[PDB]
């Protein structure tokens with residue numbers, strides 16, 4: 252069954268003092284040096300690879316080549332994404348067994364099993380714990396990216412935020428005679444922080460909550476006549492509006508924490524009797540206040556709106572926010588464009604003054620991030636035609652919609668992808684399946700919607716750009732699969748790749764063709780399967796070229812075997828777009844190296 256070792260620190264073990272009957276005594280030395288390293292207080296920054304090379308004696312590996320093989324694993328762990336694994340067989344395949352001293356008294360055929368077992372011990376008891384001792388792993392939530400923050404820096408940060416919450420209303424010290432139902436976690440968020448709770452969970456039953464919130468999502472679409480579909484709204488809006496569109500996007504600051512608890516309670520109380528009535532309402536009422544959380548041995552009451560992390564917060568915040576909408580957003584206009592999420596409001600009208608009446612109004616209702624506001628109003632400092640909202644870029648002038656990406660500088664794009672599924676494991680000798688599973692559609696589905704492929708409001712040149720961009724993402728996933736195929740499946744002949752790559756271009760071109768047909772509108776000119784296939788090949792070429800030495804032969808095969816030229820039907824097309832990496836994709840990091 253089991254093929255994978257998970258790279259996550261979460262699975263580390265607490266090391267014994269010495270080892271048992273099973274393990275060779277050499278592991279005791281490393282355990283010792285591990286404890287010694289932890290006790291040594293040094294002024295100058297910690298390089299894990301360098302420490303580990305003092306902790307695990309060289310006699311454990313016998314040769315530099317063996318040592319270098321183990322530490323490539325350590326190096327992945329030092330650079331892991333969430334959910335990433337390697338194969339368990341990486342830990343024994345291709346080691347120089349004749350050169351490992353502690354293994355000479357064992358006949359050759361039992362060696363790999365022992366090496367695997369001891370390697371696992373080291374990684375579980377020494378490598379992962381050393382990292383945990385010096386670093387806090389932080390999920391940036393930008394894909395599966397993990398950042399490793401020096402533990403003293405994090406604790407300092409964690410304390411500095413803890414006192415701010417203390418010396419505000421947000422966190423009040425409790426007498427311990429309340430008993431918490433989750434632990435307060437402080438997460439660094441770019442410039443600020445996020446104070447969420449991790450539940451045990453259990454709490455009576457988890458299905459009780461799921462069919463409790465299910466009772467609420469009813470109420471949301473009952474006494475609030477809201478419907479809303481971003482695509483339908485934008486489409487119906489743009490088609491009736493002939494003149495220049497004006498619009499604004501307003502970022503709502505901490506919607507969860509700006510919930511006025513008393514107001515939400517009265518909202519819950521009355522009147523959903525046919526829907527919830529009393530036994531439920533009473534449990535929700537006291538749930539919103541008081542919210543009590545475990546921390547540093549101490550128990551605290553959270554007095555700043557809903558707690559992010561509580562299962563009910565999301566649906567109750569939506570419930571609350573819909574009420575604020577009926578309350579303060581009543582005189583907007585039946586003919587204006589409006590759409591919202593918990594974090595977002597997006598409003599458009601051909602009447603510029605209404606876009607002010609909206610900006611001013613929304614500032615009166617909510618606390619909003621005013622630097623994160625985007626508008627094309629000429630009175631603003633820096634007016635802007637293109638408005639990002641819900642993973643999309645809306646151009647208020649051209650009405651075109653593009654997918655938003657989405658990439659900090661220095662971001663390693665391999666973090667966007669999930670190649671390893673611990674629940675559905677692929678043996679080390681089926682790389683083709685791994686490849687094919689990686690090229691499956693579901694992951695890229697939100698780049699392949701009516702927003703990207705319609706020709707109602709979007710021009711055909713826009714559909715092509717959207718498509719080319721989605722295929723650049725797919726190509727980067729392909730590239731990241733290639734890296735995994737080399738370092739974990741240990742592939743050396745990449746021949747089988749050609750036909751998998753070819754099928755993939757065929758399949759994505761075909762899904763595009765269908766989507767374009769289904770959502771065809773008056774702006775359609777003529778899209779062939781051939782044209783789409785070429786855009787796709789071009790997208791792969793623009794990524795593969797980033798490793799011309801590795802991908803030389805593949806690039807040449809594409810240029811000699813595939814059709815890369817296409818006929819365009821709009822003279823307004825930017826033909827250059829299809830020649831090169833677009834700048835938003837041009838400087839993502841594709842090289843993996845340890846930095847702690």
Ligand SMILES: C/C(=C\C(=O)Nc1ccccc1C(=O)O)c1ccc2ccccc2c1
Nearest residue numbers: 733734737745746748749801802804805808
């Ligand atoms: C996809 C691929 C090669 C590949 O992935 N290589 C590597 C990946 C990671 C690390 C090292 C290497 C390496 O080869 O040195 C490839 C190249 C040329 C091809 C030509 C024709 C058909 C298929 C082809 C496949």
